Design a protein around this nucleic acid. Structure first.
Ligand SMILES: Nc1ncnc2c1ncn2[C@@H]1O[C@H](COP(=O)(O)OP(=O)(O)OP(=O)(O)O)[C@@H](O)[C@H]1O
Ligand SMILES: Nc1ncnc2c1ncn2[C@@H]1O[C@H](COP(=O)(O)OP(=O)(O)OP(=O)(O)O)[C@@H](O)[C@H]1O
Ligand SMILES: Nc1ncnc2c1ncn2[C@@H]1O[C@H](COP(=O)(O)OP(=O)(O)OP(=O)(O)O)[C@@H](O)[C@H]1O
Ligand SMILES: Nc1ncnc2c1ncn2[C@@H]1O[C@H](COP(=O)(O)OP(=O)(O)OP(=O)(O)O)[C@@H](O)[C@H]1O
Ligand SMILES: Nc1ncnc2c1ncn2[C@@H]1O[C@H](COP(=O)(O)OP(=O)(O)OP(=O)(O)O)[C@@H](O)[C@H]1O
Lengths: 362, 362, 362, 362, 362
DNA sequence: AAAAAAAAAAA
DNA sequence: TTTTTTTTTTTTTTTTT
């Protein structure tokens, strides 16, 4: 009896695999009998234990095939083909709505009865983050609104300030919240042409730690970042489709993503300054540090950088009407949950503790 | 039973798919029955809902085949094959006439009863654009003639002027009106060879914000853009064919397309300056800036940037005698439609508001 | 009869062959009759003599196949596919636990009846190393915890001291104990791109002798090393992901590995000094030097550089309960063996011989 | 009847063909009748005349076959696979023993019945070289043992002496005997990254003309090489692995090979001076020069630069028990030949003529 | 019935054809009936008219094949394989025997066809060169034999003279006779590696305008040429192999080729000068100058530079015994042409007119 | 190493 | 011929600047 190419394609679609070796590596695990399957007993990985029963009968045949890498290749290209259609035909609202469903699915695991997290530590993360900037949840909401409208020449924000001011702590959380990739523009220009190739089909990009010339009297290291970035004006604008490439691939033509620039206290050319909507100044304020010194778990679990900490902050602060009508049901249930197993008096004490510079928890 | 490779080729022709992953992604949607297809019920995308019921019977087989990507490759190469025949056998007037049918079809949907657009917003865009330059409709019509006649060494216009003067805004609209590609020449020569390969078989190219040198006396940073164009003079001239290249493909030999160069106010070597038929000086106009701030929908929906906002200008201002006979029927009908939905009083009111920096609607 | 592709895949999986020519080479040795196989009689290589008896009947057919390169490719693909899954799904504790029992397989061969390692010389290596630093087994064991937990900021160690003090001796041993690779960031910036590319998917990295720029008056040649680490703050801290590339490969994104920095007694900026959880100072010791002169086999057999010498140290000194539960039973057998082949008076006599430099075995 | 792919592979194995065109060419020579084969009559090439008898029957079928290039590719891959296994599993003793067999095979033909070489001139070469340094045969034998054991910090020998003193001559002969490469460390540190990449998988390296600072009292030209070696201590010491880089390839990790350093009478830093097991003082000897003036065939036939001259010296001077037990049979044979080709008195008369500075054959 | 691939392979070998499209085109011509074939009846090309009748019956089938480029690939590889079998075993005298046999195929163009310049002014070339140096033809033959034997230390000739001294014309002539390449050594040490890498796999080199020091003594310019070439002793003497570098490539090891050095009247250091076999002084000769002033065609038809004029000299002056056996027949077949077309007296008129200072006449 | 396309085995 | 299976090989990227 023949192997089904269809079932391998379906598994790749449900799992969203788009690496041929990962798909091959996963699907070969199903060749062993389900009854004895130690991974299905321990239930370590859902990408295994949800599917082994369904696929065992086909995987036992696949294990004897001579085609194994070409079977997986068709499956992976089917997943990429879907991902390419969705990139052209969804609105940016639907893209973000899908991302929030993915984060909510993670949260439903992380805080499930099998989950390793617990909410007070993540909610302390929300309490610390809401002290990093005034009206923080409005700043996040304005950012998402900006990244969705993608208005030409009005679609990049600048984060500027001293070192150890939380710029990339925040920018990394916004980047996980939306999905996207960080870029380094300080390269020699000959290689920069491949760095921008990372941006293809991303919803968002972050230009991190752009270095200028001058400012050495401020003890800033010099660098070419600002000078390189100033060549990319039509990439920032989004007024026209730019041409993007990867090693051994012919150029894609598409509008460059919106996003963020994070910078220390260099000077900036007017040709760039005209292309940022908003500049947010970050400045150091030691109680946030004293708090982190006295309650470290925020760093050790990477809670403070995580986009899920921002999603919890939005679920906490924002009205239900500000989300997509498709997703409101899940968000109301999460609002009910957070009002049930957490309390406003606790939150107020947490935010007070951060402002006092003591460690957050009791 | 077996897949009809012909039906897949036919669908790619009817929708002009020239990417394999896109064609594969689209054609796999037709697996499910049109009798309950939610995308058909919503009528969300015409390249789906017009075709699903026709192709369902074949796609149900295509989903089982072991060589799907090859079937799509022959289809995509057929589309590119026809596309190359047309580029050699049609006159430039006929090519433009096809493009105008494409825009008019998109308009007939976009302003149809199923369409989203309200024409009053777009005609406000026409009013704003007509304030951008003196005799704007004459400038656009003169540009079209220039791009059609393609006269040797008389093929490029220079858009020059300071920041936020509209150079990119108009260039992007004309680029959509004709169809074409933007090109970045600020990169170094070593990989510039693969950028120019994007111009193969295009009707226009646009060179965007070509960085000059010595502009620092006005705080404009220097770059290689002008130095690079001064090495491509035979490409601009169009007197003789040139050789154009894509990764892993052998060189095409053709005459390079005509187009636009956009610049901020650097100086230009006379060797290069001789290539330009015309220079247009753009300058910022305070009332135009004020106007958009009371009518931001023009930017959010990218109206003033679109080619359709120029096509509606031509339909409004120009005599029917200025269009190719094959479309004069449609253009008369569109003149008649606008003569029902508008009156000169409304359009004069819009212009008067723009000239005062008032909101365009009222 | 026809070749079993499955048996070739088993042999690749057991041997962990991921090189197609090596697998083709090994598997072709099996075609000769096992009864006369000199390579088996002499037990020269376990990758041969364990398996030849099993696979002979299949290799005799494989030797006549016309497809041999494909059969070895699919086998090698299967091994690489398993490495992908393990890399993405094991915990760092499981990674190190596998790496330990992999070293125990080497020890079981080395000290077996068929092996060639004199355990007394290796145990003298343990004695010499335990005299290199105070509380050496704690220094090693605390390092392992640090590399497993990978807590941001608290995840790099500094080794500093004069030339000829044991720094790379210990760092090379830790590299074998844990896996990982050495790096040399004394280059100029323009090739750091491919140098840092070595770190992809490594459990550790070691920065080998990063030179300072100042202090050369102590006969300390100036170099770029520490100035480059100042520019790698984010790679060290490990709070956020970074992009890495290899020649001819597209970039991959991951958190940079934890590790060690080693240097001569240069000065260091405090902006970098804050990034080390601990610093170890190494100093020359005449008794160790005179011991090495009188116990040369330690060098000539590369004992003190090896990770197995540190694993023997951990087996000797640490309590069983703090190894991972999977491996504890195998470690108990090794403790019992070492308590059979040695006693505390003998081991103390070796330490005492080192402490006076007389040479270990007397 | 059908082509035996195995028999084609067997010919490639016995001939050590790495080249698929050379193998295709060589194997097609066998298609013509053996009875009349001019090459089998004159017996010029053993790779033909040993094998044409055997393969003729198969080569006839091969000449009609359509797959000819494919059959050769599998054969060549089998030879490459065998070479990679050996490279990972042989001991240095066996690797050297293979080279001696290759040199003896080459000797057996060049001094065979068709022998173009004259053994009297080659033994005059032995007599000349044995006068260049005292106890030369022990110098060669000790060097071989040193390069075979590859013991840490006991791996490099230093050749010092003026222009025209013999350093490059003996180094070239030892490179031919043992195999290896020559490196030029006098380059700027920029290029050394690709110099050292030549050492990958080599049995030896020789550093040529490693020039230093100072020496102007000897009118020596200054250079960087000595300072560069003083930095590369790990490559010399050989205690731990290093990373080696070729062009385009990614870095490989191995123990750097043992070798030789050659220089004029520069001053050597006391740090670098510790890296060498032994120093050899080469000195000009006018009587050897006057012998060469009267013995030009030694230079014109490149005898004294050859490795085979050293192998002849070892065969003459050393006892059979110093050779590897595999090859001792051929050594006995060659002694039993050489002891009747020459008397002791004839060899002493050569060595006497050299010492007199007379023509060696007089 | 079916296409014989072997017949296509025979035709490829008998025509020695080694381009797949050239072979495809020529073999397709045979598909037409030879009874009518105008290319045969006109006897245009032997590669057609010799073979058409034989291959017609096979080409009629080949014309219907779907594999035609496949069939021709195998035929071409058979020729390339045979070419490589020979090249690996070629003696250095046969290498030059080939070069002249090929130059005779080119000279057969002026044999019996009008497709060439008139030979009477080429013999005026022969006569003028034979007045430049004493016994000029011996100098060519002695040099030629010197380059064939490749005897170490006896490999380089030095041409010294001012401007307007003919030395460069003779060097260019010798270069074009032999097939080497010319190298520049006046560069800084930075650049010499890639210059020397030009010499890989090559018969000669020539060194041009190697500048000295102190040239202001005679208003000669200065550059590092002589200072550099003095260091290249191992490249010149040819006693041992050297490794040579092309850009973007790994090194190759070979014995650097013999050649010519051309130099102005600078001071040459004895340490360099001793490496030449022979110095030839070139000196200006006013009668030769007045001849070539009066016989412009010597220069303007390239005659005195073109190396084929040196063969044309050797062809006449030298015995038939001095040439290699496989071209002796071809020269004596050539020799009689000049013995029919010219006489000793008219050649002496050419010589006499050159010596008189007048153009060649009668 | 991936992409373009050829080249061969089994029905 | 038709379908399934195996193979060829380079270009690009890197190197050079
Ligand atoms: N406002 C603040 N005041 C004091 N300490 C801060 C503040 N924000 C962040 N920190 C501390 O700074 C550390 C580093 O933060 P982060 O990496 O976000 O800084 P950054 O200035 O954006 O850095 P970079 O430009 O190098 O990415 C945090 O882990 C936290 O301990
Ligand atoms: N002539 C104008 N006067 C005032 N505002 C303008 C004008 N043209 C455009 N704008 C505003 O400036 C924005 C940017 O315009 P645009 O990018 O086309 O200018 P540009 O002159 O091409 O600029 P740059 O040199 O920075 O690329 C527009 O979206 C619009 O909001
Ligand atoms: N504490 C010590 N005192 C004296 N000799 C030592 C000591 N530790 C090691 N040695 C010897 O000195 C050699 C040099 O030390 P090691 O190999 O670790 O290099 P290092 O000079 O300390 O490191 P690096 O080259 O990275 O600066 C060792 O290989 C060993 O032979
Ligand atoms: N001991 C010697 N005495 C005199 N002449 C010698 C001696 N050894 C070699 N020669 C001559 O010197 C020539 C150069 O010698 P060799 O190739 O060994 O280079 P070298 O002396 O090491 O010098 P360099 O540093 O220039 O490479 C030899 O070809 C030989 O003719
Ligand atoms: N013996 C001669 N006397 C006078 N003129 C000569 C003589 N030989 C050649 N000529 C003419 O002088 C020209 C210059 O000489 P040639 O081309 O050989 O260069 P060269 O003397 O080597 O000079 P340079 O070093 O400047 O290249 C020749 O091309 C030829 O026209």
């Amino acid at each position: 009896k023949q192997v089904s190419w269809k079932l391998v394609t379906e598994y790749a679609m449900e799992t969203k695999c788009d690496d041929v070796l990962l798909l091959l590596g996963m699907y070969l695990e199903f060749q062993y009998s389900f009854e004895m399957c130690l991974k299905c007993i321990k239930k370590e990985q859902p990408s295994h234990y949800k599917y082994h029963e369904k696929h065992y009968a086909n995987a036992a045949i696949f294990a004897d095939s001579k085609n194994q890498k070409t079977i997986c290749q068709q499956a992976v290209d089917t997943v990429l083909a879907k991902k390419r259609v969705d990139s052209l035909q969804l609105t940016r609202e639907q893209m973000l709505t899908n991302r929030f469903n993915d984060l909510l699915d993670r949260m439903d695991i992380m805080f499930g009865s099998t989950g390793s997290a617990d909410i007070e530590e993540w909610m302390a993360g929300v309490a610390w983050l809401h002290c990093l900037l005034p009206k923080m949840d409005s700043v996040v909401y304005d950012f998402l609104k900006c990244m969705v409208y993608n208005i030409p020449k009005k679609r990049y924000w600048l984060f500027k300030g001293p070192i150890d001011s939380g710029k990339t702590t925040l920018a990394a959380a916004l980047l996980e919240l939306c999905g996207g990739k960080a870029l380094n523009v300080n390269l020699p220009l000959d290689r920069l042409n491949f760095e921008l190739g990372v941006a293809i089909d991303q919803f968002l990009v972050v230009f991190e730690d752009v270095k200028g010339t001058g400012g050495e009297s401020r003890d800033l290291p010099s660098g070419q970042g600002i000078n390189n970035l100033d060549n990319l004006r039509d990439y920032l604008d989004g007024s026209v489709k730019v041409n993007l490439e990867k090693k051994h691939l012919n150029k894609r033509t598409q509008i460059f993503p919106p996003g963020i620039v994070t910078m220390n206290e260099y000077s900036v050319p007017k040709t760039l300054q005209a292309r940022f909507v908003k500049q947010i100044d970050f400045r150091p304020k030691d109680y946030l540090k004293h708090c982190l010194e006295r309650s470290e778990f925020l760093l050790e679990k990477r809670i403070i950088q995580s986009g899920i900490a921002l999603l919890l902050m939005l679920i906490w602060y924002r009205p239900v009407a500000e989300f997509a009508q498709s997703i409101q049901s899940r968000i109301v249930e999460w609002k009910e949950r957070l009002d049930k197993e957490f309390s406003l008096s606790v939150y107020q004490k947490m935010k007070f503790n951060v402002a006092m510079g003591i460690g957050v928890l009791d």
